[PDB]
Recover the amino acids of this structure.
């Protein structure tokens, strides 16, 4: 297909939601190629909105998948390295798909000199940085 | 099974809370598949919260699991590498399951130039 | 071909936007070499912006590419290492092509000493 | 045991305090399984309080243990990798068991443009971010 | 050449702009050695300005080059390691050549205690840090 | 030996202060086991402080130790890996024994967009 | 020696200043053992002051040394790993010996939402965090 | 040669400025050893500054050197590892020789909870 087809768009969203990657999805019988999907996306806001929802679901599916890829890795040096790569790629991607949920988490205890208060001295501007 | 049902949602939760993963929960007869679980969660806020605490409980189980995976690793190159991957994946996941508890911890001592006060100029 | 020409610049863009890299675009008959493309960009602001969105579109294509490179890696030491390099290079590049979208994501919970309020003294 | 048993809870706390991991503890003769311990924990505040103290002690014990795991590692490639994993897992866990004591430590010397003062310009809100 | 030669300076800028490294450029027929280029740079502002432009272009060229070095790496352990080194060296250098464009990119979602507001308590100075 | 006793607590301290680890101190005849040492510390604030300075003194000894471990490493793959683990463990531990002294050190030059002033809007 | 000996203290400072490590220095003919040096340090402020100066010089010497350790490494897998360890250990130590000179260096370009101004909303305290 | 002498100090500088390392400068006949160079620097502020610019010039030479070391690395495991160590050491050193130029570069987009404004409560 080249023409926008909502039925097909819907199927894409469903498959993505389950965790399948776009390139893999576009290899399925009857699917548009990736370039076409991106073009559909550019011109059809209904698809874009559904795609955003599919992306959120996709991330949640991948978050479960990473346990399985690690746990089921074949105990062979190269196969373990590949599992690691598949997992690391997913971890990186998850933070971009849903930054609020899957971004890094840090708690910073902020203290000042010698563990006391943070010491701040304010002055008038000394150069023209306006 | 596709139609949202509490008690089923309550069941899954209790199952996760006891340490069981969502994949295994969904591979049980009568259990909705992963897609259906997520759909539910998305459309039901009460299940979202309850699932969230199951998720926190699950994290506490996984926390103890990583010690076992590390300590009991088979002393062979590929098995140790696999154990490290299993542990690293869990560590990363734990921070997302309970950010306040399992997120990174840093104490930053903030000082100014040469260890003096922090110098600020305001326009 | 050295003289700046829209529609040619529009062409390159559309080509990048569809996922094609600048090297391949420039290795096409009639296409300006890389140096000439950059010269154009530098002296024409309208091409700079248009190229910038081609660049963002290109990033979205590369994002999907990294899954394929990782998942389809040949299970051999050197090939897996090469796949990892291809992926790491793309991940790094993506952040620069669209910083707001593909940059690192951190949530920092900022607290004060012993988890109390952040203590500040001002002069 | 399934029913809450303070005597057993107390023994768990003692063993944990000495650095032993929960899963290992639950393998000892007569111990409840991990799921049960977690259930005891959920319903009994007396156990939760004692468990928090045991967790603090556990971390202090592990902090000493890491030197030994490294120093005593068998000089074999795989055995060294495993020691490293056991150590790295403990380092990560310690920061979560007692963030104030075992979290990362950084001193940030904060300066501004060209090593001068930090330059700040304040303006009225330009959008409705309230 | 030892004496400053604008024609030669111009050629250097052109080659650098295309992504070639200075040391490699200075190995070309008729080129000054690196020390001389640096001396030309120190004394001739016209060259310095053109060199800054060449450095910006150089970075943009290298940014494309890294894909090729990775993608075309010979699938041999040592050759992959070398490609990685060539790539990592370029990534590091790019951020220094154009920090605004090629520096690291981070989005920090800043929150306070327990996910609420950031809690700040101000006090009068308690020591003489003026 | 379980009952808290100064001079014994003073002894342990002096022992740690001289570089000796708590494991070795506790493996000496007449010495309380690790559990008992910690119990003491927890219930006695004076021992807590004194032990804290023994800990800082111990850190200074370990600091010099890491040079020796690195420089004198046996030039064999597994031994070098073990030496690196011994050193990395010590480096990590040093930061916790004396955060102000052995913590990470960063100088952050803070600037605003495009290297201009930091732009803030306040509501 | 056990008794404090300024002549010996001075020699220690000289050797340290040149980059030699304390443990190595204490192996030299006639030197006190490390424990003794630390005890001398604790009780003699004149030695402490000279030792601080020696530590600064030591770091500057080590900063040059790292180039040599890397550049001269025997091209053998294990020997390269050891050189790396010797170098990494020195890099870490340098930042602690002189944090201002040898600490990490970062320039943070701080911007706000969507690349605009940093958006801050202040409110009255909502809990008693005083 | 131990007594501080300008022109000698000027010489060393010019030598460093041209890319030569302090070790080589000091291994030249008539040149003070490293200890003496440092002593000088410590007691003479004018030499400190001049040496500082030699150091910045040296950094610019090393910057170009790392490309050569990486690109011309012998395609053998141990040689590539050695080249990587030589490069990593230089990269680390460059940041200390000229922090403003060769330090790390980060752009932090600072936002508040859920991407809204940064929320602050003041006491």
């Amino acid at each position: 297909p080249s023409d926008y087809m909502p039925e097909v768009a819907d199927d894409i969203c469903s498959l993505l939601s389950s965790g399948e990657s776009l390139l893999k999805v576009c290899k399925r019988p009857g699917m548009p190629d990736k370039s076409t999907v991106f073009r559909w996306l550019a011109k059809h806001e209904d698809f874009r909105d559904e795609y955003a929802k599919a992306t959120e679901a996709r991330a949640d599916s991948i978050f479960e998948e990473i346990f399985e890829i690690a746990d089921n890795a074949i105990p062979d040096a190269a196969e373990v390295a590949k599992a690691r790569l598949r997992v690391d790629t997913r971890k990186w991607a998850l933070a971009r798909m849903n930054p609020r949920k899957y971004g890094d988490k840090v708690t910073n205890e902020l203290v000042g000199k010698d563990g006391g208060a943070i010491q701040i001295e304010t002055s008038p501007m000394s150069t023209l940085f306006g």
User: Anything to note?
Assistant: Residues 45-71 of chain D form the longest helix (27 residues). The radius of gyration of chain D is 23 Å. Chain D is about 60% helix and 10% strand.
